[PDB]
Design a protein around this ligand. Structure first.
Ligand SMILES: C[C@]12CC[C@@H](O)C[C@@H]1CC[C@@H]1[C@@H]2CC[C@]2(C)C(=O)CC[C@@H]12
Ligand SMILES: C[C@]12CC[C@@H](O)C[C@@H]1CC[C@@H]1[C@@H]2CC[C@]2(C)C(=O)CC[C@@H]12
Ligand SMILES: [Cl-]
Ligand SMILES: [Cl-]
Ligand SMILES: [Cl-]
Ligand SMILES: [Cl-]
Ligand SMILES: [Cl-]
Ligand SMILES: [Cl-]
Lengths: 243, 242
């Protein structure tokens, strides 16, 4: 059923908090070699210490995944110091600050920089060696756990985009007969249902972070292409806060 | 079955060429008041001249839809000089330079800037007045060959634009804004993917005039989705590099 990932170099972005953190713990338990990236040094170090306790070799890099040059310079260090990434988990997400009208547009831009464009940059960095070895796994994490109304459109759109990235990349790999590089996407149901047609997008039930990761890991280890989960976007209540 | 759009202020981006131009002509015949945006002054003036020949009031603006400030500056002019746009056609698309002659990454960024983020900026500029009046129509044109280096960006951007449409549609519904409609011209691949749908590699496809016929009919009947076959020749594009 489930593949071994022992000794595989697994790189997880956004590993200092949330799903990314919990995902790192699961790979640690499986004795992968971990490369953890996060913008927040403190969260990153906490994740890494626990992963070591779980029995894994772990390396950390503070990386701002809104910054393409930071991603590439850090990827260069990974390749030189650690080796070739075999499982890439694109998990980093934008974190919103102010709601205020005047400062929204840069954060709408950042939403796409982190949630979508970062996946291009990491794939460009790490897919060539995977292709060369015909061995790899690219994991598009397009679910994250509440977003204020001004960012709802950007946030949701960016998830459709990430799912599109996965679907297109999957078929490109197939077209090119790159049979050893697998893809897995963690996808919110709203990408299939929309919001109004699916009351769960407003009412739940939703999943605990532990449940999301259990489902993600099961999908990765059985090499499922798609893993649908209910989001916790709280659509109607998010929108009623203006009405 | 079809609404009249007589005297509606219809803004079309990418109106200096291709289906934007052909769409401008159809709105011209229906006696809309046209606002045409494009990065090319001559293409723009050519489209305008024919729209005027077809009997319509027409105004033009040279606008780089990759540039948020330019969009907002131009929108301010439209509001002041012409009035409140009632039909917004988000049609501008990225144009690529071969990676033989340019770096890839700025063009991947530009793909999202034009094909997705521009729709945010035009919507933020024009939707408020539409909502105030409870009258408007936002048209997401997410159908437009692309080389292998840009195929992933190009395709992903169309999924994104369809996601924009679907989310916006539901926000408006949730807020009970009944008079602002949405229409999306969507490639079939967003529902089927590529390998599962041989037409994405083999066709048959539509001629531009057919695409525009279907677009106009959907707009005028206020259809939310209009699926069309794309012409990206997926497998042959990729297998070329093998
Ligand atoms: C597989 C292939 C194309 C075949 C071989 O040269 C390896 C490269 C690795 C990077 C891939 C590229 C295809 C196009 C991809 C998928 C992109 O658009 C970003 C990363 C790119
Ligand atoms: C138009 C085209 C080729 C079509 C499109 O990819 C844009 C580029 C822009 C640079 C041009 C190139 C044709 C060949 C040229 C003229 C060169 O040899 C140097 C610059 C090159
Ligand atoms: Cl991060
Ligand atoms: Cl980040
Ligand atoms: Cl959902
Ligand atoms: Cl076109
Ligand atoms: Cl390049
Ligand atoms: Cl298609």
């Amino acid at each position: 059923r489930r593949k071994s990932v022992t000794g595989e170099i697994v790189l997880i972005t956004g590993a200092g908090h949330g799903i990314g953190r919990l995902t790192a713990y699961e790979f640690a338990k499986l004795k992968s070699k971990l490369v953890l990236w996060d913008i927040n040094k403190h969260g990153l170090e906490e994740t890494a210490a626990k992963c070591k306790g779980l029995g894994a070799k772990v390396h950390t890099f503070v990386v701002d995944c809104s910054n393409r040059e930071d991603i590439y310079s850090s990827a260069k260090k990974v390749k030189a110091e650690i080796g070739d990434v075999s499982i890439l988990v694109n998990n980093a997400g934008v974190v919103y600050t102010s709601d205020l009208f005047a400062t929204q547009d840069p954060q709408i831009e950042k939403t796409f920089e982190v949630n979508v464009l970062a996946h291009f940059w990491t794939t460009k960095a790490f897919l060539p060696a995977m292709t060369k070895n015909n061995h790899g796994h690219i994991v598009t994490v397009a679910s994250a756990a509440h977003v204020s109304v001004p960012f709802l459109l950007a946030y949701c759109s960016s998830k459709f985009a990430a799912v599109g990235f996965h679907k297109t990349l999957t078929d490109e790999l197939a077209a090119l007969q790159i049979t050893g590089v697998k893809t897995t996407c963690l996808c919110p149901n709203f990408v299939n249902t929309g919001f109004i047609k699916n009351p769960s997008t407003s009412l739940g039930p939703t999943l605990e972070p532990e449940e999301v990761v259990n489902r993600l890991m099961h999908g990765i280890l059985t090499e499922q292409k798609m893993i649908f989960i209910p989001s916790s976007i709280a659509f109607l209540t998010t929108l009623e806060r203006i009405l």
